[PDB]
Design a protein around this ligand. Structure first.
Ligand SMILES: CC(C)(O)C(=O)SCCNC(=O)CCNC(=O)[C@H](O)C(C)(C)COP(=O)(O)OP(=O)(O)OC[C@H]1O[C@@H](n2cnc3c(N)ncnc32)[C@H](O)[C@@H]1OP(=O)(O)O
Ligand SMILES: CC(C)(O)C(=O)SCCNC(=O)CCNC(=O)[C@H](O)C(C)(C)COP(=O)(O)OP(=O)(O)OC[C@H]1O[C@@H](n2cnc3c(N)ncnc32)[C@H](O)[C@@H]1OP(=O)(O)O
Ligand SMILES: CC(C)(O)C(=O)SCCNC(=O)CCNC(=O)[C@H](O)C(C)(C)COP(=O)(O)OP(=O)(O)OC[C@H]1O[C@@H](n2cnc3c(N)ncnc32)[C@H](O)[C@@H]1OP(=O)(O)O
Ligand SMILES: Cc1ncc(Cc2csc(CCOP(=O)(O)OP(=O)(O)O)c2C)c(N)n1
Ligand SMILES: Cc1ncc(Cc2csc(CCOP(=O)(O)OP(=O)(O)O)c2C)c(N)n1
Ligand SMILES: Cc1ncc(Cc2csc(CCOP(=O)(O)OP(=O)(O)O)c2C)c(N)n1
Ligand SMILES: [Mg+2]
Ligand SMILES: [Mg+2]
Ligand SMILES: [Mg+2]
Ligand SMILES: [Mg+2]
Ligand SMILES: [Mg+2]
Lengths: 574, 572, 572
């Protein structure tokens, strides 16, 4: 038998009933009424140093667990501190709820403390951004916003709700507190149409070099239906930064070191929960010169962008993949192309991984960042199980080296399609609190690190067992290198030889500096035994990542990378 | 003139408009402009977080009156500015943010960092545009610069972004017009004599006139304001945004009598000041006896919440001088002002003296007021507070700072927006603007963690700042609201962090203080070795004035409980 | 493929996507596209007011299921569409508006008609963009077309504009991709069997199940809906947007029992229908006994106001069929449905009979119900109402129309938006879509004055419409609220205008009727001579159902007084 209670109590209850067991945030007066109620219900409060980091932690939680996560921030600068992290979640299509404080209704437009247009600022990068002015309707609005965060009436992504403090304190009569709005809801499961399933299976049977490229929507599955389709199709398989870990490394389809060869030669590109954005050359005929196109997703955000499918399936991707696998029951696939790529991939990836253990110092006498990945690979099955480890990468050159150097991980997170520097520490904290049994390892550039370094404090106060490894090359180095190479003028891209280990120790974390690459395995072993911990690696400026070599820093007219841009320029003059 | 890329013409526009430094953080989308600024000899002050670059621009413009410039790359570079842009918008500070953005051919296709920057910033800018016509970029820059001053709006931040393909396009020489490149003077609208006369009539009829200053008054040197105070007999209050205009010894300057002035004035004259929550919305509940007059060069300081019986829209100096002239032959009645001044002398002097001996709290740690006591004791020894730029930031620390900082050439703080983390970026902007003297920033530990890594910026660019941290291991004004009013403290504690160690890790001088008697020495050594941080282990057992008045509770009608109580009584 | 201008490629995209007509009003900014459509043989239906062109597109898409297209020039051409765009957005109707806009070089310089079209339309469109990259225009068109269907949003209007310099730019052939030119099928997401089973379980447990249809059900042919009604024993209500799916004689069809069904159902099943104000917000105050199930192909008809114990997101036909199949072996309990059906037969038959003899009001003029009586009497004589598209518009006239129009192949009206003036533009779109039969639009005089000049469009394009005007010299539902509830009638009277004369002035057949016995003859002659208008001099002494229920008062919680009273009781 419900009673009359304040909006603030109902909001705390809505969240807990929807399966929220933690709220990331930073306290202010505008949200204290909710903050208090969450604590009294036993919801864990993870309080941070910068509200942006709380939204990064929510992001990591939802991406890893599939549970929509929640950040709570006060009016004015509390909300404006979230915009980068909200934009990043919007770009990556991650369900999350930001609850903001805002001034009481009587003072609207009168210059109360922190009256800025939060909803107008956030509308462009949210699925919903509202001020809730009717106490009796707050539960309803919460439940509808939660559904919109999952993608209802839009596509998956962040939502924003704010409740004027006078409304937070208003009582709601029990008759208006409806169980259907309080209760957790299951995810939607739209199913494929059998005609579209049949049509894709026909394209696969007629293709000689089918390739699957996965993304976000595939990563919401466990990968088993994806594997069933790979087996039934003979397709080669590429993942992206947002879809690592779905297919065993030894699978005959898994050809991660043959990215260019797959895109150049596939006659049937099958996207699974994946945008054809700049990360896949806009799906341009310039980059996929032979490919017919099929798109499978539970959101048209991964069906209609840049290329249209000969067939497009809007359905739960696991169901779609299983249905197509079933339709290929009596198909004997032609695997010769996939198998030739897999034979070459085995050698290229094994040679690359082996060479990580002995990469030479640069001309400045400092460690090559590849040695960090070499050291991690050497510790695998000794003091950590990389196969159970959540790996995070962030920075410029460091991030690009990380994409090749991180091959075994239960899960991978990074700067995202948005190129959001500073996610490493907040992501590692969200990851470690989600999965408390194993250290989380975040490898970051020094530039990226300076943005969220003070969250080391959060890791210590909340006991998040993270290991942060900093590639300390005294520079925004991928940028420094573009300046030097293409302008003959390096200016405002140098940083200093800062003591990041000392910063970590100043906030009560374990910290150590490494200048000798032979010390790396030991330093990372000690960091793992004493997490939360930072290893500050003095790295070379004389090292170009693959992203560096390919003009990422230059921003060409048509494509993110020079080679792809050159192919696009040729395509325009046919 | 020759044919040159948009990127060159932008660098030239800035330098010709008097820009000698740009704050920012490099990315590929803005490198073409970045390069051209460096080749022209414009100083690039590169930061650790783009938000801090916009804070630095803000401090430069507020102190110098010269519109300042931040430059950031596409996507997260622009989104990292939103708090600092909002803070400048709230404070009405002219500044230009130049963002990178993707090339035109890739619009809406998911290129790297294609988010709607202009839609995000439109609500908190005077202008937010994407510049797609190479030949018109110069024009757009000049018009945006005028709008940052308040043209077609009110003073505040503007945002311009140039797709990278447009940055690289040549402009023919005939389209590069001198009138858009050249620096422009500020506007100087003059008062109408009938409005001046009508204000002088109101002053002659008033027994207890009071002047409250703000942003617009602070754009003057104070001399015209002092002339009107002399001619009117008015009491004088400033606000956080208008400190240092009137000598402390002036018979009108009654800074410890804020409540008595608002309760009893029969003529409130606002000078370039909003009647926002900082002045009780100008409500009759807070000014129960006051007729109202408003003077400003922007209706943002004329129409908000209370209307003037007279409103003057003019350059405020000219308006103040004209009213002073019109009070030729008036003998002002100063008895109320003088009675407040006598009480003020006692109250302010006893308060400042007590700063040198404030007891430790019950937890055995330093009362933050001892930091202001130590700074007062060093005045005329190792620093001239009268020439010093002082910055305050935090919760309880900020409220204590408002009373403890009484001599400063200039004062900056969290602003009407309550923007925590401004201390370090403001101190850097201030120090590079005025390189002759250390700048002193006093901050809460909570606020400091937001922008602490900008200590690195201060060291790399040799900004002579001294940061003093009130390290009370807490968001303490919030922790205190929780404990007092909910009996539940949760998620407002921090730790006993080594902020001296953080500062030393970034190559700054650093010292920790636990004994209040060590403060003078530590501050002396910090001043001699700037950039420097003093980490003061402070008490949680200390309630600021803001704490005692319910700032943390957020009442229905007013920011503070006493004002809210008065508003509830007015409403029935 | 060859190199061709953007303007040609746009014309080709439209024709390939199945567009055989474009509604609009010519201007210089869109002439390049206008010309190319005509050269390709796409019919141009030019109108008197751009709003009407978008109304015509709306009616075309709602009736045919083919996305329709309006094209308007820059500035006032685009701003004239805003009501019709809002109406399509509220009703969730796919349509494309193509606006002109100024060339890129002149952006922000005050060129002719540079207003922010995309900012004005963003809040009421699924997409609103300015297309600045010639090679990407085709792609943008195809993606916008998909978003109009509901992709990345929900069904509704999209807006695209192309600066005139871009319209004139060539696209190389390699960039003209077949996949963007070609027509696309509608999406067909399928139900999950566990959700289908869980709905069938709820139906088996229910004693008084009721199905209420809307937009999404009306995109089907009704056969799957009738299968579920047969298998479930459910009562059936439609709404204005879902008429004609279930034969009137079906044992479930209880259209005169709306209140009894909502009061007593223990299982409300919405089929492609919002629980907006038209269904009492789905409030427990209006459905006090109902569990809720929601079925739709868009969460716009699943999450609003009430959540389902089950929600099915799927093509509604497939969902209905699957649930019918799952009710294999169920014997439904029809006693409640049958008791409503027996009462419905009497009430609806007595009501329809009474339409032929309704008395004149106290002012001696025709009761508008006689118009529906006359149409009923001509059925099977000079027109087949069962094949006729019927349109209603106005205040009291619209409410009388909801009861008086019982046979129509299809029905359109003012919509949930209450958009007065749709009658004539809807009738024109309907008539050009279905050229074999006259379309009959019944309208208030108030509503008609908004779009009356589109009679000219009907004549110039030979749309066989018959417009019947309820000429009560008033905005009468409003005049009646004023008189009853304020004792002051002011600014709601119109005059005894000659609407027949207006119609004849634009070359249409026209007749005025003052004697109710003349209605059958006048409507016969109008049908034989379409396009035609019948101007009926109607009473002000006639309260519609909407009038009696306080629609005009706007209560706090619900659109109607009785529902509002029930909501107030629920709230205490
Ligand atoms: C513009 C600026 C600088 O101001 C910014 O803001 S940048 C923002 C921060 N940076 C980012 O967010 C990065 C954005 N860029 C990208 O995400 C990528 O450049 C891309 C998605 C556009 C392209 O990535 P790739 O498709 O090239 O994928 P990678 O995983 O990086 O693969 C690189 C190469 O290594 C190869 N490879 C991968 N795993 C390997 C393995 N295990 N062993 C050996 N080789 C391996 C791979 O095949 C490929 O070689 P190739 O076939 O093209 O020759
Ligand atoms: C809501 C939350 C907590 O989540 C937030 O986000 S808060 C954001 C962070 N904080 C802020 O941004 C501050 C916001 N508040 C304010 O700016 C102020 O509370 C106020 C402007 C609204 C009110 O300030 P006052 O008018 O009280 O001004 P102060 O300079 O603080 O003076 C306080 C008292 O000390 C007095 N005083 C000033 N200088 C003195 C002196 N030198 N010696 C002695 N007394 C002195 C002054 O007269 C007054 O006493 P009284 O007259 O009312 O009795
Ligand atoms: C693009 C499209 C078609 O789709 C649209 O939407 S157009 C929208 C509807 N039309 C408009 O709103 C008109 C917009 N255009 C204009 O306003 C004008 O074209 C203009 C302002 C841009 C240019 O006007 P002018 O400066 O040429 O001024 P007018 O008063 O029209 O003068 C025309 C000529 O007559 C002359 N003139 C004026 N008064 C006269 C007099 N009394 N006797 C003799 N000659 C006279 C005048 O000097 C001038 O000749 P000249 O010196 O250029 O040779
Ligand atoms: C918030 C923001 N501002 C700028 C940029 C632009 C950028 C992308 S990569 C990069 C250099 C990163 O340096 P780091 O030290 O982390 O890595 P390394 O190259 O190994 O030295 C910058 C400045 C982005 N994406 N985000
Ligand atoms: C970005 C932002 N997030 C939250 C808040 C809300 C707030 C206002 S005051 C306060 C406490 C500040 O603690 P600090 O340690 O600096 O000061 P002290 O009381 O002396 O211990 C908070 C959290 C604001 N204004 N801005
Ligand atoms: C564009 C617009 N402006 C006002 C209104 C408000 C309204 C709703 S009903 C009504 C009266 C309609 O008078 P009409 O003469 O057509 O009907 P009748 O009652 O039979 O005499 C008005 C003015 C609406 N909905 N739309
Ligand atoms: Mg930030
Ligand atoms: Mg939005
Ligand atoms: Mg670096
Ligand atoms: Mg503190
Ligand atoms: Mg009427």
């Amino acid at each position: 038998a419900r009673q009359s209670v304040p909006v603030a109590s109902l909001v705390a209850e809505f969240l807990q009933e929807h399966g929220v067991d933690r709220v990331f945030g930073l306290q202010g007066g505008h949200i204290q009424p909710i903050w208090d109620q969450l604590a009294r219900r036993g919801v864990r409060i993870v309080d941070v140093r910068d509200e942006g980091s709380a939204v990064h932690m929510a992001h990591a939680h939802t991406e890893l667990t599939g549970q929509t996560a929640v950040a709570m921030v006060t009016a004015g600068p509390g909300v404006t501190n979230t915009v980068t992290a909200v934009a990043n979640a919007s770009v990556s299509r991650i369900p999350l709820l930001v609850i903001g404080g805002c001034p009481p209704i009587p003072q609207s437009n009168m210059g109360p403390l922190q009256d800025i247009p939060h909803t107008a600022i956030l509308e462009p990068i949210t699925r919903l951004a509202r001020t809730l002015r009717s106490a009796d309707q707050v539960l309803r609005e919460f439940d509808e916003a939660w559904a919109r965060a999952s993608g209802d009436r839009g596509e998956p992504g962040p939502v924003y709700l704010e409740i004027p403090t006078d409304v937070l304190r208003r009582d709601v009569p029990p008759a208006l507190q409806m169980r259907e709005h309080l209760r957790a809801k299951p995810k939607r499961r739209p199913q494929p149409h059998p005609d579209d399933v049949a049509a894709v299976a026909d394209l696969i049977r007629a293709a000689e070099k089918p390739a699957i490229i996965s993304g976000r929507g595939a990563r919401t599955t466990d990968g088993t239906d994806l594997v069933r389709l790979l087996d039934a199709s003979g397709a080669a398989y590429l993942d992206t930064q947002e879809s690592r870990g779905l297919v065993p490394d030894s699978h005959p389809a898994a050809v991660g070191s043959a990215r260019s060869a797959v895109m150049r030669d596939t006659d049937l590109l099958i996207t699974v929960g994946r945008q054809l954005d700049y990360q896949l050359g806009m799906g341009s005929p310039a980059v996929f010169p032979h490919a017919k196109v099929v798109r499978i997703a539970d959101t048209a955000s991964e069906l209609i962008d840049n290329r249209r499918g000969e067939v497009e399936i809007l359905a739960e991707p696991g169901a779609a993949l299983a249905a197509i696998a079933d339709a290929l029951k009596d198909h004997t696939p032609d695997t010769s192309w996939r198998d030739e790529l897999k034979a070459k991939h085995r050698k290229r990836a094994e040679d690359y991984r082996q060479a990580l253990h002995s990469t030479e110092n640069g001309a400045d006498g400092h460690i090559h960042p590849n040695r960090i990945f070499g050291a991690l690979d050497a510790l695998d099955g000794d003091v950590l199980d990389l196969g159970e480890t959540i790996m995070i990468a962030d920075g410029g050159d460091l991030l690009s080296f990380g994409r090749l150097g991180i091959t075994k991980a239960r899960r991978y997170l990074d700067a995202g399609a948005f190129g959001c520097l500073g996610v490493a520490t907040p992501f590692a904290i969200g990851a470690a609190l989600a999965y408390p049994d194993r250290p989380v390892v975040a490898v970051t550039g020094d530039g990226a690190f300076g943005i969220t370094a003070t969250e080391i404090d959060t890791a210590v106060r909340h006991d998040a067992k993270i290991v942060v490894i900093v590639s300390n090359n005294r520079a925004w180095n991928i940028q420094r290198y573009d300046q030097a190479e293409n302008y003959g003028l390096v200016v405002g891209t140098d940083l200093a030889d800062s003591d990041y280990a000392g910063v970590a120790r100043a906030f009560g974390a374990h910290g150590e500096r490494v200048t000798d690459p032979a010390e790396l395995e030991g330093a990372i072993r000690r960091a793992l035994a004493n997490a939360p911990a930072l290893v500050d690696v003095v790295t070379t400026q004389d090292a170009a990542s693959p992203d560096s070599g390919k003009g990422l820093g230059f921003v060409p007219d048509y494509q993110a990378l020079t080679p792809w841009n050159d192919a696009e320029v040729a395509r325009r003059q046919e």
